[PDB]
Design a protein around this ligand. Sequence first.
Ligand SMILES: OC[C@H]1O[C@@H](O[C@@H]2[C@@H](O)[C@H](O)O[C@H](CO)[C@H]2O)[C@H](O)[C@@H](O)[C@@H]1O
Ligand SMILES: [Ca+2]
Length: 410
Amino acid sequence: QYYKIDTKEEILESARTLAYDMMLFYKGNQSGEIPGILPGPPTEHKGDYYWWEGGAMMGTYVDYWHLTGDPSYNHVIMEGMLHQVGPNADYQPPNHTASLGNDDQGFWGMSAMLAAENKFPNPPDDKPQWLALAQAVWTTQASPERHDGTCNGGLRWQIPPTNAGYNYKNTIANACFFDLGARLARYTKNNTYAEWAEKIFDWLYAVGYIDHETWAVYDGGHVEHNCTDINRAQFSYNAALLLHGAAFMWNYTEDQKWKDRVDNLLTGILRDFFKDGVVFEIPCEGRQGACTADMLTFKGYVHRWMAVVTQIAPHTKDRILPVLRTSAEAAVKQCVGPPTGRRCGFYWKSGKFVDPSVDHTSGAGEAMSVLAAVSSLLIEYAEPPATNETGISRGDPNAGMRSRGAAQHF
Ligand SMILES: OC[C@H]1O[C@@H](O[C@@H]2[C@@H](O)[C@H](O)O[C@H](CO)[C@H]2O)[C@H](O)[C@@H](O)[C@@H]1O
Ligand SMILES: [Ca+2]
């Protein structure tokens, strides 16, 4: 094994080297390149990765700095986050319409929310601020045209009505909106965010994407079938994102119903995604060559989000931290690949390095996921998410409401 993680100092060193290796995939700070994105999209044969994964990377590095204190990449991350905000400061840059799902926009909004929670350095005074960016994403997702009567509510996967998948009302789009609402409520203490989060969670429960018996979290359903054709694929990031948002709602409301939802979602996640202590992407990881670029990132979010759950729902700490530890141990045990002797693959439970070429990418998602898992081993030393009591960001009451905003020509 190359990376050591037995003490705080070893974890810090390993995380620093993992942050270096993940950054090698990113070209956006170089002359002539586009800040904020990994190479791609694959539809243009420019690389393996879609725009939203750039947003996920940005968030991973906001967390990296928060967890380790290393600010080395902060300027690169600030540039990338600011470059992708779009003309209306809402993470809807029109050049990216083709991949503009509510989840894609949502992941960028969640990285901005994380920047506010982590007190990431503020953009310059003339630029959009982190809280305001999160508020803009949430506001556009709350806009009435995104909430029609099909399936009695819920967000559709896609924002543009002509995008493939507009007829699919899926968990992840709704989970992003839920998580943002819960986090905006806790940060700002504004209850309208929380009321929307309650409504969306109740919808996810009612439509049955959350299994009422097992608390498994399914993928979605289509409007032409009243959302009853549930796709029962269980992706780790769906359950984990609902757990994360539910923990924010528990912390904000102190309502036992939210504690119960945290506990039930957590029981399900441990049952379904952790195999002898190691996170496992059950829809695809059981055979090599099936996981897509998107799926290779999910276990990193699971680690980072579950770690934060232990801070804001501290009664979960003893259920979560030991399991994240064994999962991160498996992650580093297989980061031994050539040519460096430390290249990371995806198949942590297997105990062996598998070249990322088996899943047809250069390996950035695997690198991101290991960075996330190792960094998050430092959660016990980190500050919890800030609120407006101690945060340094600034909001905008008209976030998402510009007169040229895309909702005005929907
Ligand atoms: O899975 C990542 C992203 O996939 C997007 O759909 C792709 C389109 O952007 C592209 O134009 O065509 C391919 C199929 O040829 C689609 O897979 C979604 O729009 C994104 O939300 C999604 O995150
Ligand atoms: Ca490829």
